[PDB]
Write an enzyme that holds these catalytic residues in place. Structure first.
Site, PDB file in Angstrom:
ATOM      1  N   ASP A   1      -6.837   6.363  -4.800  1.00 12.82           N
ATOM      2  CA  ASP A   1      -6.231   5.074  -4.959  1.00 12.82           C
ATOM      3  C   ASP A   1      -6.363   4.701  -6.481  1.00 12.82           C
ATOM      4  O   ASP A   1      -6.766   5.518  -7.313  1.00 12.82           O
ATOM      5  CB  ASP A   1      -6.843   4.063  -3.963  1.00 12.82           C
ATOM      6  CG  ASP A   1      -8.303   3.709  -4.280  1.00 12.82           C
ATOM      7  OD1 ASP A   1      -8.838   4.210  -5.343  1.00 12.82           O
ATOM      8  OD2 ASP A   1      -8.958   3.014  -3.590  1.00 12.82           O
TER       9      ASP A   1
ATOM     10  N   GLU B   1       0.775  -1.226   0.000  1.00 15.88           N
ATOM     11  CA  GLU B   1       0.000   0.000   0.000  1.00 15.88           C
ATOM     12  C   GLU B   1       0.798   1.264   0.000  1.00 15.88           C
ATOM     13  O   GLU B   1       0.203   2.284  -0.327  1.00 15.88           O
ATOM     14  CB  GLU B   1      -0.844   0.014   1.299  1.00 15.88           C
ATOM     15  CG  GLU B   1      -1.787  -1.136   1.174  1.00 15.88           C
ATOM     16  CD  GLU B   1      -2.937  -1.044   0.182  1.00 15.88           C
ATOM     17  OE1 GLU B   1      -3.126   0.075  -0.427  1.00 15.88           O
ATOM     18  OE2 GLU B   1      -3.727  -1.925   0.064  1.00 15.88           O
TER      19      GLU B   1
END
Ligand SMILES: [Cl-]
EC number: 3.2.1.17
Length: 162
Positions: free
Chosen positions: A20, A11
């Protein structure tokens, strides 16, 4: 290597609000804030999550606090899900991490939809599982990450991550 390290790798860390892979507002170590296209709404969710007026920016400690919470919730989510628990229980330590990773990323509901894969993992049919997991939107949209998780399921080692 462990789950925290693994996900930190997958991440990354961003201290300012960002979009994202799906274009959704997120912060820190993959903490999704909202699916809403509104930045204010995102800012709003952030302040509520952190407990202060952030103006879209948090500190490293605040991000790790969110991360700790997110990992905990995912484990707890697995353990509470009828479809997931049994799979998780059947696996070794490394592979458990792989399952956690997926749930953190897609939610327990999302993972519970990989019925076929789940069954295969439960039967310890590594290679078959790996192939089935690859036939997914998940893999097609985020191949690099998907490949690492899949390799982990396939081998039961951290190789993909070293
Ligand atoms: Cl990826």
């Amino acid at each position: 290597m462990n789950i925290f390290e693994m996900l930190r790798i997958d991440e990354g860390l961003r201290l300012k609000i960002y979009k994202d892979t799906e274009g959704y507002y997120t912060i820190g170590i993959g903490h999704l804030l909202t699916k809403s296209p509104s930045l204010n709404a995102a800012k709003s969710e952030l302040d509520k999550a952190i407990g202060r007026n952030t103006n879209g920016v948090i500190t490293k400690d605040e991000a790790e606090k969110l991360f700790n919470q997110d990992v905990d919730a995912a484990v707890r989510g697995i353990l509470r899900n009828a479809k997931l628990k049994p799979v998780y229980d059947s696996l070794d330590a490394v592979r458990r991490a792989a399952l956690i990773n997926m749930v953190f990323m897609m939610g327990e509901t999302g993972v519970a939809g990989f019925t076929n894969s789940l069954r295969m993992l439960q039967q310890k049919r590594w290679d078959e599982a790996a192939v089935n997991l690859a036939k997914s939107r998940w893999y097609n949209q985020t191949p690099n990450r998907a490949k690492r998780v899949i390799t982990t399921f396939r081998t039961g080692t951290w190789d993909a991550y070293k």
